Design a binder for this molecule. Sequence first.
Ligand code: HEM
Ligand SMILES: CC1(C)[C@H]2CC(=O)[C@]1(C)C[C@H]2O
Length: 408
Amino acid sequence: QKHRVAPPPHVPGHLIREIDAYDLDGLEQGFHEAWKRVQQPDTPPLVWTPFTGGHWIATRGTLIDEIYRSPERFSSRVIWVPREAGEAYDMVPTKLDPPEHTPYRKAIDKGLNLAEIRKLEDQIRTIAVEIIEGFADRGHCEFGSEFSTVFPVRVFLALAGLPVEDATKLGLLANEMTRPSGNTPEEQGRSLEAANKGFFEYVAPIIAARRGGSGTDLITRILNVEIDGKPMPDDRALGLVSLLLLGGLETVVNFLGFMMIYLSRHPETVAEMRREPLKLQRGVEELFRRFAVVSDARYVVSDMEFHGTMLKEGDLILLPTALHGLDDRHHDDPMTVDLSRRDVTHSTFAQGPHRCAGMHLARLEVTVMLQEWLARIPEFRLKDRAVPIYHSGIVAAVENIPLEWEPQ
Ligand code: HEM
Ligand SMILES: CC1(C)[C@H]2CC(=O)[C@]1(C)C[C@H]2O
């Protein structure tokens, strides 16, 4: 039974749509397919749902892109639905608008910029190869539990200088951040609050140990960047390091599952990558267009009319990033991966000042993964009659991906 709120006076009945971002209609056929059901030919650009506390949903790529690019009109002071969870959320610098955001993003970029990420290629490759060689001769694996949940976590924990044994603890907190438990906005607010506290408890001793530290790990490097000519304050550092863990543990893991389910059903596309290695390298961004996983929100700063829609200060707008990359008004045949597509524009990493700081790392992990996978498992398929299981939320998830091949 679903919790419902009544529409506020400024929301007209013709814009109401019953959409549950934490359990989308049609989700059993796929996360991306379920969001695409919302984006019908005559669907208004902004629709309002009475679920998850009541909130708007942007249904077209142009609005999603514009909202992300417009922090003065759409603030990050709340970026989660329901509102109770968004108010409890404390990660840095995602809760900040410019100019407070700027010095912290500069600090993060010191650790995650493209030049720094390029240095990581070979250690990423050795992690990938080690895992793949564990099952490549077997002729089958469960891709989720044997690879996609293992490879990016091992990469990030090594990069962050953290013990691999912490993977389970951190994954459980991350699950409750992005798909918080509860049948009620207040309940989900409390679940996110508890997970966010778990992250802060975990990172606080690490921060204390690495301030002024001599380590070369990502945390030491970012933590010791000065903010306004001074050491980063404790409150900001806790949210900053927690956000790095959240991005490192619950983004690429889920992206890889969706990507691999598609490739397993499209052997002609896999064969193109095999025959043309540059098409793989140049085609990775088209994968990011096609397999968005994040759906988060912004806070309407002022009463306004936006794309013909009356919004009130404090209204929340959910931005399902899949509805940019998969918008048929932006991309012809949007559900098809076309490695040669010239225009790959998407909001999978969002836009504007908060555009994903980890995107260089994400791109490199995916590129190295495909290169090492195809070198050892060049052909593969989804097990006959297998049914992946899908979850929707602020970050989408998929599990049960049994793959099969003839060992080479
Ligand atoms: C498939 C992979 C990934 C996707 C789809 C993704 C998506 C996103 C999105 C949509 C945002 C903007 C959130 C908002 O402000 O509303 C973001 C921000 C961010 N991401 Fe990623 N991300 C990915 C990988 C990573 C990785 C591996 C890291 C490594 C730590 C990371 C770190 C960050 C950080 C620090 C920010 C905050 C940037 C800021 O506020 O200025 N992300 N990401
Ligand atoms: C929405 C995000 C994916 C993005 C900002 C968050 O809080 C994330 C959950 C991690 C980071 O990459």
